Design a protein around this nucleic acid. Structure first.
Lengths: 374, 38, 166, 240, 96, 121
RNA sequence: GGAAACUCAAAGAGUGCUAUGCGGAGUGCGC
């Protein structure tokens, strides 16, 4: 019975904690009673994570009562005894036992992580990196592991080198999930605006545009199309006309819905060449992968691509006097697209009409241009 | 510095997964190789 | 000196660390060949440390093809360079225990800091972990192995024989 | 071809005797309403609404395991719980009977190297769930280790003269300890020069030097010339 | 060292220290080479304009109660660690 | 590996055709595709010979799927009229099968031919 | 005299079950 070994591992801290006057033996025997029951339920057979959770909760509560009677009776913050580190180090020991016995549930993994973050005032990312490593190895497929690890060591440590390393590692392990690609681009623009405004701070007190986001977007679209087309047609590549064409257009549908999500939460970034990068996104979406989405099928996608091509220059505000100066490109594009499209002529005309209706003495020439657009 | 505050942020499910609670309910309560015995 | 082993399953790859070494001279003894049949004394040898499942069943068939031809695939490359520690110059070459001498030289070429062992000891604890199987993972997977290898078996047979669809 | 025959459980579980005037040997079908091979099926009616379930006649002149059964083996290891690795599964001649004597719960990993019997084997295998078709050469169990897990009996109907190395490699890779080994030996395909039980003695000795302890052999003489069914168990620990 | 080994109570036996190497972490590239296509593309974009923390040393070159807050929140990892070391040495030279 | 794969070269073709001729004179040979598959599923067939220039090829290519199932060896030869002349019969045969018989006088030649064609495959 | 159980007592076998080991740093060395 190793429960006896743990139970008399915990004796010396309560020995010193009793011989200095904060508890008495008549209640340290009570906490020893409940600790005995908890240890038995823990390393018995058929145990559970809820037993580990209640043990953690009880030990944290007796830690808080220890600090409370420490500042009440002794009127000090700590008594530099053995107990003060001991009780949380055995909390961490309980956490370690529970992760080794039950590496399944990310709830217990996550509260181990959260307790070690909150202890992170004292304790170490030397300790954090090990548990993130073994958690990452036990779950390579789960994406929130990589995302929470990157969020921690970029929003405390801000080590962009390790964040690039673990994002490339996460995309190496699963280049299938759209979310990890999406948040890789999100971190890329996050630190790219960080160092643009950092050199702006340097320029105040005294190249690196979105080509990285372009490259990872291109490989994102290629890999995502490959993995959607391999997610469908499970074991055998189906060979006919219409199902092959339908699977290619279904991949193109899902992929360009994803690039639309890339655009529509790409424009949150204002401190960079947002219009030039959205133009690069549409230019990469122009040439197609065995489908030709513009002139051939996916005509609804071609219509939304045309409206995005107009609105990427037409990105403006209510104070639109510079838009009254530079809407000649908008009128030229709307004319050159109405001279191409057949019934998407009517669709794009109604869409540009509703977009200009969203755009609308300064209203007087605006009313003139509104009658021009109507 | 206001833009650096309003920069968008990476999204997980982890601390929600560690903080959130349990709320739901509980509801209360031949062999293939055997010949037909004649 | 067998520090890690790689077990290839229908659902995905697994990599186990070796806590205690099996005995090398008495490996043909009754009391040693029965501890790979006792599960509670086989887990004193082998700890699971990583398990990357195949994303899709198409990738499952692809990895089965690449292992059957002895090649290294990219998910295997990913799990190996995640788990295996980089060594120094020639001191302490790290060691896998794999199941075939044809997968040997290919991952030796992909990882010159890794050494591959496939002897009787390696095949011994390989068949131990194959016997116990899904009890090692304690539920850390998305898949049941018998039905998974049913689907993978019909797929691999069909792709090997070029069975027509029309 | 239309008369009525009673059924009875055999000594081995899963296999049944069909006693009529003459008395057939039969097994309980996995796929009712069909005959794969060209055998006769005896259909019985269980009386709840009444069910109609059928039983495929196992031909001992066309499957060496059924030759060994009604020649009399003291025990098999093809029980209706077990899993069976069928080395050298040519067609649905014997693998169908081994499949449905295993039953709906356990798997028969049937292997095969040749391609035309392989493709009619997978076309057989779509109709019953519990068999796994393998289209690999049996000499390299490494290239199908991906997909069979810890089988607890092996049958070997391979007919090429490196049988001992075949069964040794496959049993080392996949057969669990104290597991069953059933071998069909064909003397004219091992070597035609020397006589039948001389090559049976050679193969028995190669088995027990590969620490498959042989318990039992049978000549199956009224059905086929110069074959032998050798039943042994993988000892792996304490051959003595 | 053999007198101090015969004067020992217990001998956990591989006495020459096991030269175990740096454990495999996901936090560093373990071969220092491009592994895949996105890795080689991101490195060939990053090789022309990145930092060996030269610009990090330049931006960490510093001296109002919010400009220091903005510079600290826009600092980098190695700059923050080196500045923490320099401020720790400064506080050790200043206080008691 | 086109469709009729184990196609014999010239010398092995000639020795299997002469053993075919003495088998036919000994009345140990059954000739033609459907008599061949009939003796194949009777089970008395030592090895089978198929002429791989027939019109078309599938009419005998049905025979490998039975013969390699029932474990008898099978050879292709290059000419139907060569097989017909070697069977000792007026029309071109395309398939031929040696019935097993222990009262044969050609047994050792049969076995030598069988060993050569099994090493061919 | 034969038969119901959550009637109990005593043995046996099988299936399971994990059966399951001063501190942050900083300071010079250890490749």
């Amino acid at each position: 019975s190793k429960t006896r070994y743990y139970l008399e591992q915990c004796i010396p801290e309560m020995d010193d904690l009793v011989e200095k006057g904060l508890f008495t033996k008549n209640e340290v025997s009570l906490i020893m009673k409940k600790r005995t029951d908890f240890e038995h339920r823990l390393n018995s057979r058929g145990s559970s994570i809820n037993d580990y959770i209640k043990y953690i909760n009880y030990e944290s509560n007796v830690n808080k009562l220890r600090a409370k009677r420490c500042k009440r009776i002794l009127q000090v913050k700590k008594t530099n005894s053995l107990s003060d580190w001991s009780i949380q180090q055995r909390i961490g020991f309980i956490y370690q036992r529970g992760t080794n016995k039950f590496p399944q549930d990310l709830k217990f993994w996550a509260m181990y992580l959260n307790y070690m973050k909150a202890r992170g005032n004292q304790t170490s990312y030397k300790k954090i990196h090990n548990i993130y490593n073994q958690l990452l190895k036990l779950h390579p497929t789960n994406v929130d592991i990589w995302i929470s690890c990157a969020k921690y060591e970029y929003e405390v440590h801000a080590n962009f080198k390790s964040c690039r390393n673990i994002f490339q590692n996460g995309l190496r392990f699963n280049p299938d999930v759209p979310k990890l690609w999406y948040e890789y681009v999100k971190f890329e623009l996050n630190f790219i605006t960080k160092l643009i405004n950092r050199r702006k701070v340097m320029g105040l007190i005294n190249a690196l545009r979105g080509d990285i986001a372009l490259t990872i977007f291109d490989v994102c679209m290629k890999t995502l199309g490959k993995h959607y087309i391999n997610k469908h047609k499970g074991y055998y590549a189906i060979s006919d006309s219409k199902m092959n064409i339908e699977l290619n257009k279904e991949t193109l549908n899902y992929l360009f819905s994803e690039s639309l999500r890339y655009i529509k939460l790409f424009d949150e970034f204002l401190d960079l060449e947002r219009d030039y990068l959205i133009n690069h996104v549409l230019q990469f979406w122009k040439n197609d992968m065995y489908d030709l989405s513009l002139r051939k099928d996916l005509p609804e996608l071609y219509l939304k691509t045309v409206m995005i091509d107009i609105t990427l220059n037409i990105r403006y505000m209510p104070v639109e006097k510079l838009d009254i100066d530079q809407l000649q490109l908008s009128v030229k594009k709307y004319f050159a697209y109405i001279s191409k499209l057949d019934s998407a002529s009517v669709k794009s005309l109604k869409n540009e009409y509703r977009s200009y209706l969203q755009d609308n003495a300064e209203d007087d020439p605006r009313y003139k241009i509104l009658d021009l657009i109507i | 510095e206001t833009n650096l505050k309003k920069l968008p942020k990476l999204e997980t499910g982890f601390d929600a997964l560690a903080n959130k609670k349990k709320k739901k309910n509980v509801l209360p309560s031949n062999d293939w190789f055997t010949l037909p015995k004649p | 000196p067998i520090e890690y082993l790689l077990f290839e399953e229908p659902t995905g790859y697994a990599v186990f660390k070796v806590k205690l070494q099996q005995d090398d001279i008495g490996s043909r003894l009754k009391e040693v060949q029965e501890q790979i049949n006792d599960f509670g004394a086989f887990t004193k040898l082998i700890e699971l440390v990583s398990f990357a499942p195949f994303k899709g069943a198409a990738e499952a068939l692809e990895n089965a093809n690449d292992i059957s031809e002895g090649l290294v695939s990219e998910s295997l490359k990913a799990i190996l360079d995640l788990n295996l520690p980089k060594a120094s110059s020639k001191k302490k070459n790290i060691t896998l225990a794999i199941s075939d001498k044809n997968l040997g030289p290919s991952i030796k070429e992909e990882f010159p800091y890794v050494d591959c062992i496939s002897n009787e000891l390696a095949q011994d604890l390989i068949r131990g972990v194959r016997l116990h199987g899904e009890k090692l993972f304690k539920g850390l997977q998305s898949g049941d192995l018998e039905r998974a290898q049913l689907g993978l078996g019909h797929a691999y047979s069909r792709a090997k024989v070029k069975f027509s669809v029309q | 071809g239309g008369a009525k025959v009673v059924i009875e459980p055999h000594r081995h579980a899963g296999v049944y005797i069909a006693r009529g005037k003459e008395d057939l040997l039969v097994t309980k079908n996995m796929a009712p309403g069909e005959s794969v091979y060209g055998e006769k099926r005896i259909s019985v009616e269980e009386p709840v609404p009444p069910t109609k379930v059928e039983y495929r006649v196992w031909n001992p002149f066309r499957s060496k395991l059924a030759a060994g059964i009604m020649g009399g083996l003291d025990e098999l290891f093809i029980a209706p719980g077990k899993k069976v690795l069928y080395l050298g599964a040519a067609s649905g001649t014997s693998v169908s009977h081994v499949s449905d004597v295993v039953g709906p719960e356990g798997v028969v990993y049937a292997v095969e190297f040749s391609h035309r019997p392989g493709r009619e084997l997978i076309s057989m295998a779509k109709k019953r769930p519990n068999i796994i078709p393998i289209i690999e050469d049996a000499r390299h169990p490494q290239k199908y280790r991906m997909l069979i897990g810890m089988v607890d009996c092996v049958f070997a109907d391979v007919a090429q003269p490196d049988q001992a190395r075949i069964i040794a490699l496959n049993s080392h890779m996949f057969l669990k300890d104290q597991g069953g080994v059933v071998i069909s030996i064909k003397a004219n395909c091992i070597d035609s020069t020397v006589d039948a039980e001389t090559v049976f003695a050679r193969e028995v000795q190669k088995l027990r030097e590969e620490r498959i302890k042989p318990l039992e052999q049978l000549t199956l003489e009224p059905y086929e010339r110069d074959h032998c069914i050798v039943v042994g168990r993988y000892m792996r620990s304490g051959l003595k | 060292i053999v007198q101090q080994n015969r004067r020992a109570d217990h001998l956990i036996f591989p006495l020459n220290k096991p030269t175990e190497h740096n454990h495999a972490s996901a936090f560093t590239r373990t071969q220092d080479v491009p592994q895949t296509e996105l890795q080689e593309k991101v490195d060939q974009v990053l090789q022309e304009s990145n930092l060996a923390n030269p610009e990090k040393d330049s931006k960490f070159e510093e001296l109002r109660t919010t400009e220091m807050r903005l510079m600290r929140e826009l600092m980098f990892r190695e700059e923050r660690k080196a500045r923490r070391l320099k401020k720790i040495k400064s506080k050790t030279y200043r206080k008691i | 590996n086109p469709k009729a794969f184990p196609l014999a070269d010239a010398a092995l073709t000639q020795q299997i055709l002469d053993v075919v001729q003495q088998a036919a004179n000994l009345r140990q040979l059954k000739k033609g595709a459907n008599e061949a598959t009939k003796t194949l599923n009777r089970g008395i067939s030592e090895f089978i010979i198929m002429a791989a220039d027939c019109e078309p090829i599938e009419i005998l290519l049905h025979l490998p799927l039975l013969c390699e199932d029932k474990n008898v060896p099978y050879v292709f030869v290059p000419s139907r009229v060569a097989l017909g002349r070697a069977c000792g019969v007026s029309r071109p045969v395309i398939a031929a099968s040696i019935t097993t018989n222990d009262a044969s006088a050609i047994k050792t030649q049969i076995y030598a031919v069988k060993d050569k064609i099994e090493t061919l495959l």
